Amino acid sequence: LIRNNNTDLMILKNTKDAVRNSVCHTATVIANSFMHCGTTSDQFLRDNLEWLARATNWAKFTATASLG
Amino acid sequence: AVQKVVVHPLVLLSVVDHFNRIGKVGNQKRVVGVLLGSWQKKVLDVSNSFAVPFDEDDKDDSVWFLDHDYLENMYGMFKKVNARERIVGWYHTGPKLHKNDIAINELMKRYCPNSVLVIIDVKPKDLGLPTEAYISVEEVHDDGTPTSKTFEHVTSEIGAEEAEEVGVEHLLRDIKDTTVGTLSQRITNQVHGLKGLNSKLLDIRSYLEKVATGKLPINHQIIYQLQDVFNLLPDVSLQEFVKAFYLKTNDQMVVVYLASLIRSVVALHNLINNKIANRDAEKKEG
Amino acid sequence: SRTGHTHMPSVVGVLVFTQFWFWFPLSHFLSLAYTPTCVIGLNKDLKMPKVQYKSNCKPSTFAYPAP
Amino acid sequence: PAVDTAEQVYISSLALLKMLKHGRAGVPMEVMGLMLGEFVDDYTVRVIDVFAMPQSGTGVSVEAVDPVFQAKMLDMLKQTGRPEMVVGWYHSHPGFGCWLSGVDINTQQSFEALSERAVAVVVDPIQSVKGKVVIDAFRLINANMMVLGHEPRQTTSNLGHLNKPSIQALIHGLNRHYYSITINYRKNELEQKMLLNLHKKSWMEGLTLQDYSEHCKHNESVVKEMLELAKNYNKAVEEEDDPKRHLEEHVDVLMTSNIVQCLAAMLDTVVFK
Amino acid sequence: SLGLGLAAMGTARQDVYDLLKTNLYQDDAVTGEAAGLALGLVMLGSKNAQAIEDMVGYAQETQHEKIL
Ligand SMILES: [Zn+2]
Numbered sequence: 001l002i003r004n005n006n007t008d009l010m011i012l013k014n015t016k017d018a019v020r021n022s023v024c025h026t027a028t029v030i031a032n033s034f035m036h037c038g039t040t041s042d043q044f045l046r047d048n049l050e051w052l053a054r055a056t057n058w059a060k061f062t063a064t065a066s067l068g
Numbered sequence: 069a070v071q072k073v074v075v076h077p078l079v080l081l082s083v084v085d086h087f088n089r090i091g092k093v094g095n096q097k098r099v100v101g102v103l104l105g106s107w108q109k110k111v112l113d114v115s116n117s118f119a120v121p122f123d124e125d126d127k128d129d130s131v132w133f134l135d136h137d138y139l140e141n142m143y144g145m146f147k148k149v150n151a152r153e154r155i156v157g158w159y160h161t162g163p164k165l166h167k168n169d170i171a172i173n174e175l176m177k178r179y180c181p182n183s184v185l186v187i188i189d190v191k192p193k194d195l196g197l198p199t200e201a202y203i204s205v206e207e208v209h210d211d212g213t214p215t216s217k218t219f220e221h222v223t224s225e226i227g228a229e230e231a232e233e234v235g236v237e238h239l240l241r242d243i244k245d246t247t248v249g250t251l252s253q254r255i256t257n258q259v260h261g262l263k264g265l266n267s268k269l270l271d272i273r274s275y276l277e278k279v280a281t282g283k284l285p286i287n288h289q290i291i292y293q294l295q296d297v298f299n300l301l302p303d304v305s306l307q308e309f310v311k312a313f314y315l316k317t318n319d320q321m322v323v324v325y326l327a328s329l330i331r332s333v334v335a336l337h338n339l340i341n342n343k344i345a346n347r348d349a350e351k352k353e354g
Numbered sequence: 355s356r357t358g359h360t361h362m363p364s365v366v367g368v369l370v371f372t373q374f375w376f377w378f379p380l381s382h383f384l385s386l387a388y389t390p391t392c393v394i395g396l397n398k399d400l401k402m403p404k405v406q407y408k409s410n411c412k413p414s415t416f417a418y419p420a421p
Numbered sequence: 422p423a424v425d426t427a428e429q430v431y432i433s434s435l436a437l438l439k440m441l442k443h444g445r446a447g448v449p450m451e452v453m454g455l456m457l458g459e460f461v462d463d464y465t466v467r468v469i470d471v472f473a474m475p476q477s478g479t480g481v482s483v484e485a486v487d488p489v490f491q492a493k494m495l496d497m498l499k500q501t502g503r504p505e506m507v508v509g510w511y512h513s514h515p516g517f518g519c520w521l522s523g524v525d526i527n528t529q530q531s532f533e534a535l536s537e538r539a540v541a542v543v544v545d546p547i548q549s550v551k552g553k554v555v556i557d558a559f560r561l562i563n564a565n566m567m568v569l570g571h572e573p574r575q576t577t578s579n580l581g582h583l584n585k586p587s588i589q590a591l592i593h594g595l596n597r598h599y600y601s602i603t604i605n606y607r608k609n610e611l612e613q614k615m616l617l618n619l620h621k622k623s624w625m626e627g628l629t630l631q632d633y634s635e636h637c638k639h640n641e642s643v644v645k646e647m648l649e650l651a652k653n654y655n656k657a658v659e660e661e662d663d664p665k666r667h668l669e670e671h672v673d674v675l676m677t678s679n680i681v682q683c684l685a686a687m688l689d690t691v692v693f694k
Numbered sequence: 695s696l697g698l699g700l701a702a703m704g705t706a707r708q709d710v711y712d713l714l715k716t717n718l719y720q721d722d723a724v725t726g727e728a729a730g731l732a733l734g735l736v737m738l739g740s741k742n743a744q745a746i747e748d749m750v751g752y753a754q755e756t757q758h759e760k761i762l
Pocket of ligand 1: 481512513514521522524525
């Protein structure tokens with residue numbers, strides 16, 4: 001998974017500018033997780049962190065679950 | 069006397085809730101409440117009801133307590149909310165009346181001279197009519213018998229107010245049968261009628277067996293009203309009745325045949341049209 | 355599975371993922387449904403030799419789509 | 422934390438019937454009453470029971486929440502064996518739609534003062550036409566949270582299935598001040614059957630026979646309509662290269678009526694001899 | 695509880711089962727909601743008569759539809 005890791009962050013970029021700050025952030029939080037499952041690649045999570053902190057309550061639970 | 073007692077769905081729902089509330093912790097027999105409603109020419113309309121804290125003892129069948137002031141100020145509150153509701157009786161969930169109920173009915177009569185007690189068997193769900201309305205009567209029994217209190221029965225039925233009607237219909241919304249009926253539900257209605265008639269005849273036969281064996285005393289009256297049942301049999305196989313029955317059966321059968329022919333011709337036309345359409349599509353594909 | 359067996363983690367995870375109508379955090383459970391699409395060239399106990407093998411793609415190449 | 426859209430109010434059948442009956446009774450004037458029950462958990466509001474309160478000239482408002490009546494009824498119902506706590510208040514808006522006005526807003530914050538998770542229930546009695554119960558549940562969102570870049574309620578699940586709300590609430594500022602709570606009526610099996618006992622036909626109705634002199638007239642009428650329909654069907658089919666549906670409906674009516682009458686006749690002939 | 699149930703999937707360990715059963719008996723809505731999944735995961739395909747018995751005994755005894 002690590003050596004053959006290749007995720008198109010362009011689609012995540014053009015999605016993260018389309019979210020209107022609805023709850024869909026949580027879905028994005030897991031979507032990249034699916035794109036990064038077992039790849040240990042939180043590059044998007046590190047690069048985009050203010051929006052990562054833009055979500056709280058159970059969204060924080062979801063974000064930590066995605067990171068794990 | 070009272071000709072009828074029409075019970076709204078609200079009171080039966082309320083007594084269900086009261087019995088569930090009490091028996092959830094206080095495993096006990098009948099729970100007693102008071103039934104309010106509006107009178108008419110002679111027919112009572114039970115509309116709202118409330119629960120009065122009651123206790124009883126199985127010993128001596130007279131150690132009981134139904135609160136007086138509680139009834140009085142529940143009625144005060146209800147009349148303040150709605151003054152059209154008058155005390156018109158009381159209810160208990162016990163399937164059978166107890167030896168105690170005479171005292172409670174007299175206590176209710178103290179609040180309403182024509183007080184009628186409605187037994188609502190919340191626990192059983194069966195053929196129908198979960199409400200039985202009973203009125204206390206007092207007479208010399210005409211034909212020279214020792215006098216007692218006795219609870220004369222008055223017929224009851226379940227009616228509904230428009231708001232209660234829409235409420236209950238929306239409350240079911242998953243098992244309500246079509247009001248148009250259609251063949252399946254008419255046949256099930258006929259089966260239900262047969263089952264109810266069988267159940268009633270079985271109950272009457274059990275009562276007659278009890279009377280004959282001596283376990284119950286011969287009423288000597290009303291029993292001959294059951295004899296009047298026995299005389300009212302139509303006596304089918306009479307020649308005139310048989311001829312008329314066959315005539316009307318054929319009159320209905322010809323209409324049934326005409327409708328069946330109409331349906332068969334319609335189905336044949338539909339099949340011809342469908343075959344033409346599919347052949348048209350097949351030939352137009354090329 | 356590869357040998358036609360049923361993969362219990364996959365079915366379990368997809369079930370609890372479909373059970374996301376009532377709980378969003380269960381969505382990550384879908385991770386148990388993924389299986390890597392890999393073949394590993396391990397010959398000895400610890401050796402990964404650079405063995406060269408090709409495919410039989412008839413008309414053209416495929417796989418990794420778009421940038 | 423913030424409440425969830427998955428939160429729903431469990432209304433008992435008795436409670437709903439009581440509220441609808443009171444709303445109809447008080448029409449055109451607006452009524453109100455407490456909603457006994459228990460919150461049980463964060464995501465549920467169990468409305469076990471509701472009791473009406475005397476109507477006051479001020480209408481649905483805080484001055485019409487007379488504590489003497491409420492306290493006496495509460496303690497005395499608990500004496501009967503009903504020790505619930507107030508979870509909210511229902512009130513009637515005849516011909517207005519399910520929404521909260523400013524006075525309702527004041528009453529709702531007064532209710533939230535003592536019970537944070539109180540629910541304001543709005544019922545339209547006249548609009549509660551047969552087969553349609555217009556009922557809604559609301560709870561206020563203070564301007565502080567929603568202004569400060571915070572969603573009024575987190576959608577932790579997909580229970581936000583609640584359809585697009587009636588536009589009347591939108592004009593009356595539904596989401597601006599009071600988030601609506603999705604509804605879920607709780608019905609037991611005992612109360613379901615004993616509500617079914619309302620329209621249930623008696624056993625004597627199944628074995629009864631329709632008036633024979635009326636059945637013949639009905640057959641004559643419907644068969645004559647079928648004759649006109651057959652003329653129309655012949656004309657339509659011939660001029661082809663809605664008589665059919667009407668003919669099929671008439672046939673269904675005739676067949677069901679005659680078959681049911683015949684079978685009832687046979688059952689009556691065998692049973693009563 | 696969710697993590698312990700997921701990680702101990704099908705291990706059939708008595709200690710983890712007992713701890714998750716205590717968590718379910720705590721009756722804390724969300725805590726029980728996760729404890730149900732955890733107890734199912736640890737008992738995954740086990741057919742323990744005790745497990746199913748206790749699970750159903752709590753199932754028709756408790757409120758908090760989320761725990762259901
Ligand atoms: Zn209002």
